[model samples]
Target chain A: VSKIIDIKTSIIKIPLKRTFIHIDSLAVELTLDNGVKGYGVAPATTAITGDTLQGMQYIIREIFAPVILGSDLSDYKQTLELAFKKVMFNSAAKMAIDLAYHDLLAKEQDISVAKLLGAKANSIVTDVSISCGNVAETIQNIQNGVEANFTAIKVKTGADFNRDIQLLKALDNEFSKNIKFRFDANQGWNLAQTKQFIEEINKYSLNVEIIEQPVKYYDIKAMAEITKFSNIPVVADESVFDAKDAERVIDEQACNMINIKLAKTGGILEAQKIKKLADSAGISCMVGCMMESPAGILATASFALAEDITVADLDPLDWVAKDLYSDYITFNEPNIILKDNLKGFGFNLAENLYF
Target chain B: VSKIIDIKTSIIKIPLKRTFITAVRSTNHIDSLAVELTLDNGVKGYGVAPATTAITGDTLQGMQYIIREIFAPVILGSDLSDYKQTLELAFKKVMFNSAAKMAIDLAYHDLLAKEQDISVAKLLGAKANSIVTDVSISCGNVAETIQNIQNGVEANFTAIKVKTGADFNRDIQLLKALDNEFSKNIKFRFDANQGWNLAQTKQFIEEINKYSLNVEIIEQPVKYYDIKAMAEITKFSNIPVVADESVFDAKDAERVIDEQACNMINIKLAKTGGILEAQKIKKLADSAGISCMVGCMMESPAGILATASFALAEDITVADLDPLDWVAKDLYSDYITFNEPNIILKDNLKGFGFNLAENLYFQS
Candidate 1:
């Protein structure tokens, strides 16, 4: 049995390399009575789970820490249940605790979390995102990503269908048929517009691999209608929140694929449930992330490697200019590899780092 | 933190009140597993899992082995408060042991709901405390079928599901007989249990339409994997087709929906693993504007009550949780009152709403 002695949370503002924007993330440090320390990080996003940096800290300090302090960590399952019980939805706060608990258990066993969970894959290939907006710069980014040996590119769209079509046309002109594209509309279009957009693309004989969440998140029928008719495989991103949502999307035949984000799923525990559900249904899944630190990226990477995830979007860490931890996960251009010798999520904080 | 102190399981052979026959199989008795979990807090929860080898490919021995050798060790002395985490751990390194997983999942949910001092339906965010239910008339001789239908009608059942698929000519004759006897008074649903081919299904539907059978729906008319064939039948058939064995999980649901194979889905806790995954299938069906019915396997009162609790809690269009009505003897008292056509849940009942008979439970 272990007691949580100290809980520390801080907001880390990291500037993005491409968007010219800064992402404020919550980094949590949990110290057990046995002197083992575990770290967790989440990008503060009201857009997703409505979790903020301040709210995360408050819940961790006031609600979660007190309930978790005197708890037994030997049974990680029960410990996590205690953290989630009677709580409705503060996913970010729960995520931090969930990660820290898993980290602690892995460290205690002196094994990586991936090995602890009996992950099959040693390495995963991640797709780099092409930022939305400028056409010339987007094409340049795509060229750079391809030149860097990235096999797949996630093109951000849904701002406007015509512009999106224009962007796709330019990219198609620049790249060869071997290059694959995954489009994320971020719920930017309605039913008819999505249909027309896909029809126009198919009319041009463009090769797009997947189209994600073309319509609103709640409009699953529209998504299903799109999936039925679209030549390109449709993936649900914003439409799925929890396992129930995953089930709904899959049941409706709303999408051919699912994109699981840690924040939306709460943490690895619930995320694994979604993955299992998808895998059972013979549907494919991709592990995506919000704008989080390398620590959060590392945690998510463990999941991607453990499960039979078809796609990886662990690129948010690459977008950050600064991070507190020294890189343990190496981005060999497109592939994310965890070294064999690494232990317990495979990263350490830079010396004397402060937020 | 509450620890699981005891894990007990037993196989109960309860004789059916009548011979129950379906498209794929027939049974005179239900061989189901009654699982009891006791936490250190002294609070206990009971669950039942039917050993339907023909349907789920899970046998009683396999369930016992998995629960005793695999799941019991992982759960024993473990905390129950982290029910989701515990279930995840139990499920790790395992595949398709849905019935076994469900036994433990249901018990854990029961324990947690009791700990929270709330009804399982309330814990599941139930929109209503009661659900309307339908009765099943198994495939049999004309006299038996007619007698079963008469019993259902006299018992005040609002809906009647007729089992078919043994013989095409016999099935046509039976439906014609039913149409002649009770077509104007009662609603009818048909389940072929994946017994018919595309041609046979077309022939049956055409013949039934000629008789003006007015069947509400036809379930699993063709083979489970024959989505193309099922879709073809659904496209032409006058009656809406509901996918049963063709849809065992979310992936199957996706396949059926993607193919436009059927107009509805039937979700059973035994088929989908448990309430957690079953809820997933129902929500998926709901989102697509597809109606769903809560189905069941032959089980005792504990299993029946658990399935009934979920049926009450969700937005299911129909309930076929009448398997317990087929049992001659049940090990537990009824917590869910059967008001003929509807299931009435006592408002004050907590957890899964059944008390296990210690004598019956611990009997050799």
Candidate 2:
């Protein structure tokens, strides 16, 4: 009797207080016959993921909604299978439903979606990132994160090796001792330069945790070579997108770890499949996100609670986000805990939050 | 909102129409323990485990003892809504008593799926509601093995799991017998059951090279701990090797897969401890691109159904669940129909697809 009765798609603009950045995202609201509601979000990132909020909303409304309307929570997998079958590469549309349907499915069981997936963690600490910049700003940003009580900092380092080289040498004293430095090159360097970059990194007392996506993702052999010689561990972000990529990355010994982003993997379900692959290979994984809505971030952060993920790069809402969902979710500087005994995603909203 | 209000176990003896035989032991009747857990809403879920000491290393007394003392008190009144936590906690209580925890584990899933009025297969995310299962042939003489193969084939069983022994000559003789009459028809799955050593396995493989028995996979060619030999066979053997006893949990799966020990792993519910761990092993195998077959020990219809639910849920490579078809009569009140290979669980589910026969005897 408890099946999805209706689904609605909306274009939403949510404001974060700190930097005055507005999150334009597509929201999927599905209501079950049992009066349970599931909320899902796909924040607009046309520049990166290349799907507009309006197109994502249209796919959810016109293409996926009719197919997903009467899906039973028991047959949850089929609904995803059915809707996604209609169109090709509507990952954002598929993700919203996957998150929402997963929400309803877990809600029916009176548990968290993380718990339903057999992933056990109530709260997780997230590492804030300092995207690369000039030396003073890189040093300055490192200070900012340290003051914010971030135990780990992801310092972006791909294009500027000489600057990154100097930055790595400079951070040994105050920041290196406390913070775990995760260098996300964002696929910026080549085999030779990354090899040189790591040879210099080996000289420092800096606690460089991992070098992420060091060389071109396509050149796995080059990545493998860097991994063998690099004193710091290697992590694949862009290279390992799906399970197929995960298998190739592990088989080639391209990296020591993988960065699993929820949006890139379509949703939590596919993302965990990648983790499943990494787990078998005995490789650790980290979870990160794009600029996400409160709903998308909550869903993404909940996924980070899984025990296997060692490093998490989820953004904190401590920035100028006008207090939204503080009652249900707690967002201190470095940690996010789901409170109010939250069941599935826990966005118990009023009429205003809906389309 | 339902909780398990009561939990009880009873002695059950279910007859099998066909005598099931492997390399180790032969069985005519299922002398086992039946577990029935009553939910608060008056729905009764059933789980049964047979004492196959040779394979599972568990006996009836051990199954009953663990169910009563260890599993009963822990999961008696836990709310079913929080089923995953309760399921995880029961396994966390102890280790190695896989069959013991399985009885409780199956009952918990039964209660939850029954409460939702869905098939256990569907509840566990069944991609396919029906599956074709492979029947096992015991390691015996030419006449006996051929007779078993004919019986399975006549009953529409396409895949026959022919168990072999240490004597490579006799094992080859049996395969040659199948090669003589029934070679092209039946797909053969060779089970050594830790009987063959490294060289003996090679001998068996080379000897069977003359025959067209169509051996689908050689299961557990060497001993369980002898991963080096198993990997050696996996490296050279033309037929795909399946690891049965070598892997019990995901950790073993990882070890075997990493070493390239066997081409595939066999997941039996009895060996995996519970459905929870069973799925864990299945996923681990699926991710590693190592195929899997959901097999069972000498379990009753309920036990087989519980095992089959998992088989249906995933894109499992094979199903060695033909033992259920060998049961002479139904233990539960459903018109249990098995059209040879295909087992349809869509309309047949009644609490893990079984409501225990009231005519059956219970312990005083």
Candidate 3:
């Protein structure tokens, strides 16, 4: 039974390279009594989990650490339940603890986290997200992505449907069918608006691969209608949060694909359950992430490469101007290639970037 | 500044006069949690949350845990004057604990209404203070069903919603029996509770149409998630479809309306997480030119009165607050009592329009 000797947290303020935004992310470091070390990072997004940075810190220090510090890490299932029993929906905090435990377990096993999960693939291809902006800015973003050798582009919509249609028309005019496009409305459109947008896309003959969450997050039935009515495949992102949501979406045929976000699913443990459920149901999955550093991106990528994930949206780190860790995963055009020599998560903190 | 002094909750197991059955499950008694919020000024307001695990997936124990462990501490010391912000703070981090949230939401609304010296309906800008409620006939044998219908009619109910979808053939026979008895006298509605499939829904509607049963509306004939199938049913059938379980919030209403999945929506306070969210849903439906029916779970008089009060305040086209009719004893003085086809709202009543039976309520 491995006991945690110390669990420490550090809040880092990292400036964005391109945008005016700076991400204040929490980095969790767990040291086992056996001198084994593990790391985790959590990105605070009130838009997603209704969690602030302070709230996440409070949950980690006060709520989750108490349940995990003295407990045995061998029984991860019991440990997870014990940590989750006291809280209902602080998924980010739970994710931090979950990631730390998994990393610790992988270090103890003397293998990469992906290897410990019995993963077959060592690399994955990811689509870079184009933020919702003015037409020229969005087009320039896509052009920059293409120049960076990104083959797939995920367009963020839901700000205004008319402008979205205009942007799609422009994209269709600029690019050929070779460039794949995916639209994530982030639950911004209603059924009628989605229908209209899809009709417009078809009229323009845009090379749209899939549309993600065109309606409200909780409206699975409406999502089903959208999937049935639209010719393009639909992917569920915000609509699914856990196994029950995954099952409901799958059972109801809400969408063709499920997007698994670790924060949304609590952590890798529950995310694995979602992947299994999706894989068994013949529903493909896309491993996505919030604005995270290399720690979170590598962790999610490891899981994606380890499992039978069909797609990846592990591009949040790509948005980071200066990373905290040394490069272990290579961004070869569209594919993220991992090195074989590195063990565990294959990440080491940069000499100057200390926690 | 009105500080919340104490927040108290009680779980009451009230027996039903008759067996209450739905497509999902049946219950002889309902376990409901009653919440009392007291201000430092000595004014108090009460709210009730019914534990209907069959529909809501919330157990009594979970509700208690959420209130005592999660919400009580956050609420006890807060100023009640900023109830809206307090509610926002309470709900900001929580997910899917709608019933527990509903309890607190109801209490706050009651407290606010009392503090304003206005009826809860007036505080909500209700279009009316009295609403027409439809009595429900639980699924039973033909004789029992017929007797229930007769009792409802005798009790002066104009609209009657017959619970069906247990057995298609049996439902047909039951409808036939009802037609034989009182076809021209009453407005008829049917709730399948998502018991039928696409083809079953089609066949039943065809049979009802062929018989010219004159059913006003058919509610949730097929699976709640099968909106395409429901849309098809709505297109083919003469009767309009009403969505219940399909709609839980304003977003659900938007989806349903956008898809044209149903002709109407049924709003339950528990399903919408309380009166505030319920208002949002109703407003969405109203803007879409869709009528709404204010419905309820099998709750006690406290919950029934709360729902009835909310229903009376809105422009709801129909009401299904008949669960209290099945309760043998109530824990409160009835302020919104049924008077044959219409619900009577008490005059000058504030904060849910009823007084709690302190002897029975505070005993445990």
Candidate 4:
């Protein structure tokens, strides 16, 4: 059983210098008595859930270090669940701490989490997310993505039909047809507009693979109708939040695909249950990210690998605006390649780096 | 004519304490505006745009000052159409910059629509004389829900929406009891408020289907985020997903469409932000080939009238939960006593078409 120690937390904000990475950086640390410690980081969301500073502080004092202080870390599942149940809310904060614990556990065992969890996939290829922007801007981003050597790029729709169409057209024009494209509307289109939008551009015609939340989040009937008619398969983002939400979406026969996010699905454990449900239902699942840092990404990558998760949307550690780490805990672009050879999830944070 | 000037805005916090009314007082605020400039009588007409403070940032005091000091003085004697033309965004903040703008807009529309010897519904391109509405029962015990349903049926509501999610078996039993009590006469729908997982929802819907219960629709049986679950439940169950918290914006509608997530949508104006977005949603629903119903937030007749007027234009279904009916005993001694029962919109009186007592609290 792994003994609990300190929990180190940091916020790395990368300023957008006409690039994906943008923000300033801040660090917070929590130490456990045992040498084994956990590290957690917040996912950058434009401060949607208020400032991460207060959240980070609450994560240390109110959420993470207290309940986990004396508990055995070997029982990762039970310990993680206890950590979350102790606090009323703060799923995101809880996820960060659990992620750190998992990372440390793997490090102690001297085996990758993929091996520990008996995952089939030794490595996984993740899709990069391109935020909503002008066609030229998107094309530039796409070009940058190609330079970065991303296998797949998921585009976040601006919710403007004309602009989305133009963006798709530009992608087809600038990039080779070999590159795969996924569109996430974040629930942008309505009934007729979505139909017309889908019919005209035709993800198949445009060679776009999957479209996400094309209709309203709650319009299950419309979503079902679209799935029934549309040539391109639909995937739910905000629609299927948890297992219950997943069941409702499935009941509607809405989409053929589901996107699972830890924040939305509750946590790693709950999200795992949802993934199994999706698989049993014969629907394809994509493991998604919430713009988190290296620590969070490391945990996500490990989880994705453990589940034999095929589709990954894990954000790059370098995606943040700035770097919080002082030395090479491994900052290589190909660091997230999921090499089968890497030990203990390949996310061992340097011991020297502390608040 | 009132020459338009500007609008001031602020927020009011209303807390829900005892009954719904107490909560209403806590959550809602009025958007008041003073119409400025010289009228034919050189007199300014101050109008308050009444809205729920909880849902939006509208309060009585905030609206009062905005109407008295900022808007009324500048737009008193100008051409109303010209003022409308000057302000394209229309809401005042986005288009016109205040709820005061909408208040004045409603007043001008009410005047023009009435003066032209036409119903406001007609002026808004309403094809029917009435809109069908479903009565809502609060989330409570089976007996209370049943009593609420009975009161609705007695009031001549066309449909009934039962709220549940507290207990699965209890909710099912509630529906069975409701059906047994008032079988073929009333259409029934259930709203579960995200209470069930896949297993529980499956068990419930299968049981209902086995009984061949004539349940019309079920809203949000699963959590809001689990779109896939909703879709799966719809596929596996006899009921369709009537989404509420799921459809926040037009794009959300699009996502649902793309995913085939639900069969019907319940569009609330407050949830969509305002009428502009609501209209877009209706248009989206129409284009995507989905059915939609316009639902109400906790609003009085004035606010309801404004929303209903817009809904009529879109040819959407209406499920107006007129609180006045249920709380008639508490509202007023002689408030909205219906002589005849009908589901669709009907001609009755001027303005909101509801005749209230002279001492009606909202008339002022």
DockQ for candidate 1: 0.01
Sliding window of 10 residues with minimal summed lDDT for model 1 chain A: A346-355
Compose the digit string of candidate 1's lDDT tens values, residues A1-355.
Answer: 6777787877677767766227767777778789887777776664466455655665677657776776667766776776565344457667877888787778888888888777867788888887777788788988888898987888888876778878767876788877888888888888888888887777664567789889877677889999999888898987886787888787779988889988878789999999888988988888888877777877888888788675888877568653343456666768777767566776644332452
Model 3 misplaced stretches (Cα beyond 4 Å): A1-236, A241-257, A260-307, A310-355, B73-76, B329-332, B360-364
Tell me the docking grade of candidate 1: incorrect
Compute the lDDT of residue B214 as modeled in candidate 3: 55
The sequence of per-residue lDDT tens digits that candidate 2 reaches over residues A129-178 is 78668778778877988887887888888768789878876776456466
Q: Write the per-residue lDDT of candidate 1 for residues B107-188, one digit (tens) a residue.
A: 8888888888887887888777677777998888788889998999888885889888877778878877877788555888
Q: Give the TM-score of candidate 2.
A: 0.50
lDDT of 2 at B228: 80
State the fraction of real interface contacts model 1 keeps.
Answer: 0.00
Q: For each candidate, what's the DockQ? A: 0.01, 0.01, 0.05, 0.03
Worst 10 residues of 4 chain B by lDDT: B21-30
* Model 2 TM-score on chain A: 0.91
lDDT of 3 by residue, B221-242 (tens): 9866777887888788888899
The complex in candidate 2 yields a DockQ of 0.01
The candidate maximizing lDDT is 3
Model 2 scores a C-alpha lDDT of 0.75
Q: What is the TM-score of chain A alone in each candidate?
A: 0.93, 0.91, 0.94, 0.80
Candidate 2 residue-wise lDDT at A268? 82
The interface root-mean-square deviation of each model, in the order shown, is 20.4, 26.2, 9.4, 12.7
Overall lDDT per candidate, in order of appearance: 0.76, 0.75, 0.78, 0.58
Question: Candidate 3 chain A — worst ten consecutive residues by lDDT sum?
Answer: A346-355
